[PDB]
Amino acid sequence: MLDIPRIFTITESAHRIHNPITPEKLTTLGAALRLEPGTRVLDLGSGSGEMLCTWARDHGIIGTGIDMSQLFTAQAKLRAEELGVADRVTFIHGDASGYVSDDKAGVAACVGATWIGGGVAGTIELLARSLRPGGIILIGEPYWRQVPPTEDVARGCLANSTSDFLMLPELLASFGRLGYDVVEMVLADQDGWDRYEAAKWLTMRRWLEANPDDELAKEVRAQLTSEPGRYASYTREYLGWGVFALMPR
Numbered sequence: 001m002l003d004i005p006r007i008f009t010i011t012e013s014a015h016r017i018h019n020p021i022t023p024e025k026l027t028t029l030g031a032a033l034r035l036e037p038g039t040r041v042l043d044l045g046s047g048s049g050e051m052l053c054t055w056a057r058d059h060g061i062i063g064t065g066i067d068m069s070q071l072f073t074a075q076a077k078l079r080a081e082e083l084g085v086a087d088r089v090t091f092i093h094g095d096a097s098g099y100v101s102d103d104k105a106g107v108a109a110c111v112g113a114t115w116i117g118g119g120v121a122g123t124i125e126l127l128a129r130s131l132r133p134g135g136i137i138l139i140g141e142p143y144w145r146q147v148p149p150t151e152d153v154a155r156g157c158l159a160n161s162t163s164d165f166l167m168l169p170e171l172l173a174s175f176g177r178l179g180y181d182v183v184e185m186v187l188a189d190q191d192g193w194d195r196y197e198a199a200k201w202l203t204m205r206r207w208l209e210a211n212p213d214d215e216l217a218k219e220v221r222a223q224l225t226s227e228p229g230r231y232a233s234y235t236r237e238y239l240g241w242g243v244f245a246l247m248p249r
């Protein structure tokens with residue numbers, strides 16, 4: 001059955017936002033986009049639906065979120081009900097690879113799942129096919145906050161290689177090379193990374209307590225031990241993250 005690996009489910013079951021941005025930043029982003037009521041938002045890799053739900057509440061948007069996780073999709077639906085916006089935003093459990101909406105969106109988004117389109121360029125291209133005239137593309141993507149000196153530092157940041165990400169100005173320039181204007185941006189800070197990573201540790205510890213005999217208990221235990229050090233040594237110092245608003249030239 002279509003689903004993400006269990007480790008992700010286990011570590012992120014208590015996350016509203018599956019990315020290194022705070023709720024305050026997500027709100028800021030929504031306001032920065034100057035969205036009129038009834039604007040349609042398509043969100044590929046929509047997580048637990050926080051973006052769609054909170055923006056439906058605060059801006060009166062409508063839309064669709066597609067996510068491969070069975071758990072996070074259920075959570076998205078619950079969230080929509082909790083906030084009184086279940087009639088405004090819909091959540092589909094599915095693979096977003098190659099997903100093109102016939103219903104074109106004023107905002108077409110992929111916030112932190114750019115592998116869906118095979119990377120930044122491919123994801124932008126995919127979202128462009130669902131974009132209504134005059135609309136905005138949202139891309140959430142890491143960047144090098146500082147240049148990692150070695151491949152060991154790149155890998156400690158959970159990148160395959162140093163070339164996986166760009167420095168901020170090089171990333172912005174790459175959007176221009178693809179034929180897009182950068183029209184807005186909200187970047188994570190280290191406190192946002194702290195929210196995203198540190199919350200996993202508590203979730204893991206409680207999960208271990210409640211599931212001592214699970215097959216994954218050993219792997220979760222090992223990760224809980226090493227993650228705080230790895231995070232603070234590598235990710236927190238070297239890895240940036242942001243959401244970039246783009247409009248085709």
Ligand SMILES: Nc1ncnc2c1ncn2[C@@H]1O[C@H](CSCC[C@H](N)C(=O)O)[C@@H](O)[C@H]1O
Binds near residue numbers: 045048050069111112
């Ligand atoms: N092929 C695919 N299609 C749809 N969702 C996918 C996917 N591959 C991974 N995902 C989902 O992409 C998400 C990456 S985390 C980012 C989620 C969301 N934008 C947020 O800010 O919270 C996970 O929820 C995972 O379930």
Ligand SMILES: [Cl-]
Binds near residue numbers: 038039132
């Ligand atoms: Cl629209």
